[PDB]
Amino acid sequence: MSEPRFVHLRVHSDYSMIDGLAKTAPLVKKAAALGMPALAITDFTNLCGLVKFYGAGHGAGIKPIVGADFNVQCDLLGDELTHLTVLAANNTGYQNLTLLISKAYQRGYGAAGPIIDRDWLIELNEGLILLSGGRMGDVGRSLLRGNSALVDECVAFYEEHFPDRYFLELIRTGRPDEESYLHAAVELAEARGLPVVATNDVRFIDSSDFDAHEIRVAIHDGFTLDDPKRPRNYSPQQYMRSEEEMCELFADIPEALANTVEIAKRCNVTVRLGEYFLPQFPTGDMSTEDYLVKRAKEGLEERLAFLFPDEEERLKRRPEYDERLETELQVINQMGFPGYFLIVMEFIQWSKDNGVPVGPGRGSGAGSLVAYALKITDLDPLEFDLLFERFLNPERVSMPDFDVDFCMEKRDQVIEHVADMYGRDAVSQIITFGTMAAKAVIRDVGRVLGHPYGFVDRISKLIPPDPGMTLAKAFEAEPQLPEIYEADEEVKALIDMARKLEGVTRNAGKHAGGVVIAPTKITDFAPLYCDEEGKHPVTQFDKSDVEYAGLVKFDFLGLRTLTIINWALEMINKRRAKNGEPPLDIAAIPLDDKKSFDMLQRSETTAVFQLESRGMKDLIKRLQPDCFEDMIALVALFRPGPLQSGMVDNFIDRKHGREEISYPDVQWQHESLKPVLEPTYGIILYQEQVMQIAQVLSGYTLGGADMLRRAMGKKKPEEMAKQRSVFAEGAEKNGINAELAMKIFDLVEKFAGYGFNKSHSAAYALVSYQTLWLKAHYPAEFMAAVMTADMDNTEKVVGLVDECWRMGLKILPPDINSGLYHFHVNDDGEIVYGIGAIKGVGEGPIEAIIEARNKGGYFRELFDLCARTDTKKLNRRVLEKLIMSGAFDRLGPHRAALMNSLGDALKAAD
């Protein structure tokens, strides 16, 4: 009748971490290949892959069933931990399950892992369906004892707290006591009026995956495969059995199969994706809408007076901006996003007031004039043909994302601000996952297969260093890989296994990935993960997943460029009182400064953000970038595709009169494209040019244009066919020839494949320009801040003193009486060496040197230095390392005679 006869209600993904092999989407695609309509994933004490589950479910037509597996702990069975599955039947249940999981982690745990108390199920109860745990459950273990009274006590709990919502779970996977328990559970179930359910307790996709999952478990547990003492809790039968295979396994208990279909139908959880659940912003008695309109119009007034400080020009130039402003404002308010813009502007402001550097990145946010008006971004988008619809497209369901990051060192300062702002409980850090990439998986599998370190490292050293590296990429890039694979049985067995485990989730990361902001308690939105002491709580959804589930987040990034600008500006602005000049606003600098572009065309881009590569210096030389547009272009030009397709040469040639500019091609061009293609010498370089060509040539809206760029990325059969038609009749309607329109469409689509995000490139290029302008106008304080930042890399600071020399700057060698922790700039414009860069010293010892010398400089020699201070902060190892950096070369003798003095005078301290 209804027709499907089985669904899997207990399945682990690799997100269980203790076990599992298959990722979330692959498990969903298996279910569907099996012709199943639904699928429970019940990972161990987490919902980490839930957002991925839901996305892959919709894609495959499969209904996701939300659950988790636990180890349970009641006073009846003492210290023995038992298994339970908890399924969320509705959203009440989902939230109860999220609370249950959080509660386990917050309680803390030991080697045994996180555990729930059975009685937590009393209050955390509604909307949950429980499967009994099988032989390894409460009732299963009591049954296997054969203590009738104990069994009755155990089930009684479920009869009271879970009527019609507790199922006795039956599992045939060829494991000890399964059938004996099953026989006794079926007797219990008839005697009590209780229902039975079959599961396959799935840990892998196919039966032939068993050996690889054994290896995965052994890596986690820390055993070698051939160890007799190694836990063998799994069988080869624990794969995703088909409907028929389960139908035959349980042909004797049809209720058990049918109860899977029934439970699957009762379980209907909405996890909504792709829309924000924003926290509330302090708007007074103003609408959120109206408060944003106000701050944006008035922010636009500041920008306009900076850009056009002649009032005659500001009037004539103004309409365009006001129209852009209210056009954006309309999309933001009608989509329900003004709170978002407001939160981000507040955050950007707060981090300026306090000393919290935020990264260059802005998603596609620099194409918003409102972002600019609000001081979220610092570039005029109308000057640079940056497009609002590439950031927030009204014809689309979107989540605007400024992707703002800050340095992880300052997380506590920011968690604090955003708790004061939105509520302490509504604020949380975000989980990261450790996976087994190429080098690691080889190492891990190799050890489990019993190889000594030497054998396996002879393999892993053949995997290239490269950021993205995979085993498949490694085998193509390195010919010795194929060779030893075919020539060595042990290596073949090893790599075949490493291929099955590559990418697999191993653990919660060492550090968090960001700070997330909820409208209420975090637990209203994500479950928590914590350490063994229930500390370091983090959302069980990571960066991408947490935001897809509708939370505002701010990422950690360790990029030190804004820290450098910050420090350099502090140093510049001290030169304030020294000649009573107003502070510098790095945001207020001209973008056509000649000194800046002179220095850049000279390829002098050491310590200039993004532009330090030898390759990039080669490119700058040939290109001779003399405007900011060219700086935006550099990252788009400097790629393997553009260089090995002649586009870089075309761009450079058309720039310097060596090649005629066409819009874009000699034959296949149209003059209406000239304003669009002008800044790039008629080359389609940007994603936004793709969009403007569809708008201008064939009458697309900017939002419909962003939909065509998106369709060009996917490259699907039916997809294009339709846009190809819109684009045809759009050009026809502009009086443009059909064959030309189509031939230009082919070119747009060719170049769209390399097409760079102009707004992403521009936000970064502005930061390059800032480091470039600083270097040109305040070389001493700029290099000083850069050398401070790189202090712990000695190779790197050395290359920076070389650059300083090359610049005509005077960097002074370590001076004990003159030096600070940071490099700084004396009243002469000479760089005073930062003592922090002397390897083997440290902020602790140095603070104690400055603390002494301050209080009455001081010092006149080595004896006088440790005459007071202190061994308990300024010991010998630090002193000898100070001598050899030459820090005492202005007082007494040289390094040699200082080491053998050392001494000796040492003891004259006390």
Q: Which domains does the chain have, with CATH numbers?
A: 1-270 (3.20.20.140), 271-432+511-560 (no CATH), 433-510 (1.10.10.1600), 561-910 (no CATH)
List all residues 6 or more positions away from 247 whose beta carbon is below 8 Å from its beta carbon.
Answer: 5, 6, 257
Query: Would you say the C-alpha torsion 707, 710, 712, 714 has a positive or negative sign?
Result: negative
CA–CA separation, 636 vs 758, rounded Å? Answer: 9
Q: Which amino acid is at 412?
A: D
Indicate the SS3 state at residue 349: helix
CA–CA separation, 376 vs 371, rounded Å? Answer: 5
- On the question of a cis peptide bond just before residue 859, with omega within 30 degrees of 0, the verdict is yes
Pair 165, 227: CB distance under 8 Å: no
CB atoms under 10 Å from CB of 544, counted, come to 13
Residue 671: its H or E element: none
CA–CA separation, 661 vs 683, rounded Å? Answer: 9
Note every long-range contact of 861-869, with CB atoms under 8 Å and residues 24 or more positions apart, other chains counting: 861/888, 861/891, 861/892, 862/888, 862/891, 862/892, 862/898, 862/901, 862/902, 862/905, 863/901, 863/905, 863/908, 865/816, 866/906, 866/909, 867/908, 867/909, 868/909
CA–CA separation, 542 vs 49, rounded Å? Answer: 9
Q: What are phi and psi of 508, to 5 degrees?
A: -75, 135
- Way it was determined: X-ray
CA–CA separation, 896 vs 884, rounded Å? Answer: 8
Q: What is the DSSP string of 286-319?
A: S-HHHHHHHHHHHHHHHHHHHH--SHHHHHHHSH
CA–CA separation, 24 vs 12, rounded Å? Answer: 9
Query: Would you say the C-alpha torsion 356, 359, 365, 366 has a positive or negative sign?
Result: positive
Declared resolution, Å: 2.3
Pair 445, 498: CB distance under 8 Å: yes
CA–CA separation, 195 vs 160, rounded Å? Answer: 15
Q: What is the DSSP letter of 717?
A: H
Which residue intervals of 734-873 are DSSP H helices? 738-752, 758-777, 779-789, 794-806, 843-854, 862-865
Look-up of token digits 């605007």: 400
Token digits of residue 528: 């928590």
Pair 555, 405: CB distance under 8 Å: yes
